[PDB]
Design a binder for this molecule. Structure first.
Ligand SMILES: [Mg+2]
Length: 706
């Protein structure tokens, strides 16, 4: 086969050629020595990688036999202390993570997550640190299409004015005047290096004049006004010549907000990458972002302003980018050993995306720049416990050697999405104490893990109910305490999950405020538009101060984290039960087809209620596991799931385009088969992970196109 041989490794040609002719030029790193690091690191670190995975299965099997007899909560706690699932909590400590960008240490705002494989969205996500508030309010349902405000083909003046009014109220709410509002405003000036606003009768200044930050144009009549609030910036574009500002009282054309302050470029649950050719598309895009020459169009440059002091300064016009690698589980045949075994895709992701990130700290090569303090930011998903965190640090050290970068350059975003990590979260941070820039609650995976771990105990509650169970409410608060009790304020981000309802922007703006009220300096949005709307929340809420007043407090006991979410012993009705089955089969079929048939890892799949859900691979983990739990405890038969899948499939076909229908040949469509395997084999998948079945089935389709 077409694999370059280097030591004990057979490296697929497209990978070797890409690492050699694209990623290595500009790193000051010698090719034969790089590849030697790859061989050496893989040889030394593979065993421990393997041992950790075996360790998970040990615990998961021990926990199964326990639930097959034993309904106590204090012997269950003691039992997990025996098997080394629950480890002692260390003495309180402070993190020591140096060389971190201001976007992570102090600034608090929304955080975008994007499939790196999609060169188009990754482009937008990087340019989404700035976004029109007008566009955002106008397009979505934030301003109700209620009274002549309906979106049409031509511009709606009724809807446009309502948008303006809304932005007017936000300006009053964030950067208040000394007397009056921005609604009565008529013009802007910066006299004496101070912002003064014209009113119809008088002229007021800024009640808090420090919130004035700059401007562009003439000082006595600018082309723009720059404001700050809660770290985030605000731009009032002044142009009475544009078709908005002509009918506008102050000439305001638009309001621009600092939206996606950071973006996570994603190699894991939002992308489909099952072979060596796939990983290179991802790497080639990640490369583009780091040189700053990726195009479809280009990436944005810095934004120049004029200080109130008189000088001229600059602001980053791109979102500080993370990259998220895959977890420890999977292996990818982008590299095989001499015996043919697939090499761990985690280790490859650390090496390659690590290597590629070198361009991010430098201008030609490539013209544009990412980090300013010299840091690489890797999100690690799906870790189970302190030792799996330690291993990843050691890997970063080993990878750092190979690339010849100072130790602790590769910072680590820790993700709380596995039950064993949650209950040992202080230990985990401690293992990453010199690297960690990020913790985060990922309910979707966390719920996936929660179901599978206690799946021998009994029938589990519906997935709609899971978001308000005491384990998850504990979990959320528990995550913030540990980060804050570790010194996270002014040092690292404390973050929370993602808004999936991509078109319910009204609900989001109404609901998502709870997360920075819970003291989190970052929360996950699906779109550049959702980032802009979600910026509003950080202006309204002083997250720095919320963080402060939570300090020291212990809101979540270990008794409340092990509260398993069973149901109250046969308390449903056949109509409900089949509603849950049909609904879970809906979110599974809808997602798998795009994933298997087209290799798409994240898409708005209309649910059973026609609600556009931005579903990624984690949502597949909840639905499949839940159904598997209801299978295992006799809530439904195997014929139900089958009758349901057959029932829900042609409706999925009706929600979809060079597209390949599942119905009516359910046994000839690889998508359908993959679907019901995730359910029927679901209880047997490790920690409920969907990847194995998802990958073989995607490769078995690539292959079916000879
Ligand atoms: Mg997850």
């Amino acid at each position: 086969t077409d694999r370059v041989s280097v030591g004990n490794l057979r490296i697929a040609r497209v990978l070797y050629d890409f690492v050699n002719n694209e990623a290595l030029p500009g790193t000051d790193i010698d090719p034969d020595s790089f590849w030697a690091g790859v061989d050496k690191v893989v040889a030394d670190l593979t065993p421990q990688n393997q041992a950790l995975l075996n360790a998970r299965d040990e615990l998961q099997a021990q926990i199964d036999k326990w639930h097959r007899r034993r309904i106590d909560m204090d012997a269950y706690r003691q039992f997990l202390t025996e098997i080394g699932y629950l480890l002692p909590e260390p003495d309180d400590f402070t993190i020591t993570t140096s060389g971190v960008d201001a976007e992570i240490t102090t600034t608090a705002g929304p955080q975008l997550v994007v499939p790196v494989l999609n060169a188009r969205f990754a482009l937008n996500a990087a340019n989404a640190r700035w976004g029109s508030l007008y566009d955002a309010l106008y397009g979505t349902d934030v301003i109700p299409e209620t009274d002549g405000a309906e979106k049409g083909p031509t511009y709606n003046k009724v809807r446009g004015d309502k948008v303006i009014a809304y932005a007017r109220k936000f300006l009053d709410d964030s950067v208040p005047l000394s007397s009056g509002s921005f609604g009565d405003a008529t013009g802007f000036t910066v006299q004496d290096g101070q912002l003064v606003v014209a009113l119809p009768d008088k002229s007021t200044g800024l009640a808090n004049p420090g919130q004035f930050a700059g401007y562009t144009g003439a000082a006595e009549s600018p082309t723009s006004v720059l404001l700050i609030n809660h770290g985030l910036h605000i731009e009032i574009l002044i142009d009475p010549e544009s078709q908005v500002g002509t009918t506008d009282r102050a000439g305001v054309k638009d309001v621009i907000l600092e939206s996606a302050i950071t973006t996570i470029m994603d190699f894991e649950d939002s992308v489909a990458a099952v072979d060596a050719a796939d990983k290179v598309l991802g790497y080639r895009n990640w490369l583009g972002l780091n040189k700053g020459d990726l195009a479809a169009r280009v990436l944005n440059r810095d934004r120049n302003y004029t200080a109130p002091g008189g000088g001229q300064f600059t602001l980053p016009g791109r979102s500080l980018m993370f990259v998220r690698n895959v977890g420890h589980l999977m292996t990818n045949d982008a590299i095989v050993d001499t015996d043919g075994s697939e090499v761990f895709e985690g280790i490859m992701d650390a090496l390659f995306t690590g290597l590629i990130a070198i361009h991010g700290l430098k201008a030609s090569n490539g013209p544009l720049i990412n980090s300013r303090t010299g840091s690489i930011y890797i999100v690690k998903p799906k870790m189970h416990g302190p030792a799996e965190v330690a291993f990843t640090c050691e890997l970063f050290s080993r990878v750092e050697d190979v690339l010849g970068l100072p130790q602790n350059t590769m910072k680590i975003g820790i993700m709380d999405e596995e039950r064993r990590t949650t209950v040992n979260l202080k230990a985990c941070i401690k293992a990453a104490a010199d690297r960690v820039v990020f913790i985060n609650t990922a309910f979707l995976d966390r719920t996936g893990d929660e179901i599978h771990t206690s799946m021998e105990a009994g029938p589990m509650v519906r997935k709609g109910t899971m978001k308000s169970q005491p384990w998850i409410l504990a979990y959320e608060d528990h995550n913030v305490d540990a980060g804050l009790a570790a010194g996270f304020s002014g040092r690292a981000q404390v973050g929370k999950g993602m808004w999936t309802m991509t078109e319910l922007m009204a609900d989001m703006v109404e609901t998502k405020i709870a997360q920075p009220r819970a003291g989190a300096s970052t929360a996950w949005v699906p779109s550049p538009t959702a980032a802009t709307l979600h910026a509003l929340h950080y202006h309204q809420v002083d997250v720095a101060a919320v963080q402060q007043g939570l300090a020291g407090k212990r809101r979540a006991t270990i008794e409340q984290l092990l509260t398993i979410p069973l149901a109250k012993e046969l308390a449903w009705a056949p109509d409900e039960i089949r509603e849950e089955v049909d609904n879970n089969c809906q979110s599974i079929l809808g997602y798998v087809v795009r994933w298997v048939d087209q290799g798409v890892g994240a898409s708005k799949v209309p649910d059973i209620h026609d609600v556009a859900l931005m579903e990624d691979r984690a949502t597949l983990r909840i639905s499949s596991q839940l159904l598997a739990n209801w299978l295992r405890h006799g809530v439904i038969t195997s014929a139900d799931v089958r009758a349901s899948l057959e029932r829900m499939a042609p409706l999925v076909d009706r929600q979809n385009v060079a597209y390949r229908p599942m119905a009516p040949n359910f046994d000839d469509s690889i998508a359908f088969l993959a679907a019901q395997e995730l359910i029927l084999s679901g209880a047997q998948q490790p920690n409920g992970y969907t990847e194995p079945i998802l990958h073989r089935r995607r490769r078995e389709f690539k292959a079916r196109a000879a």
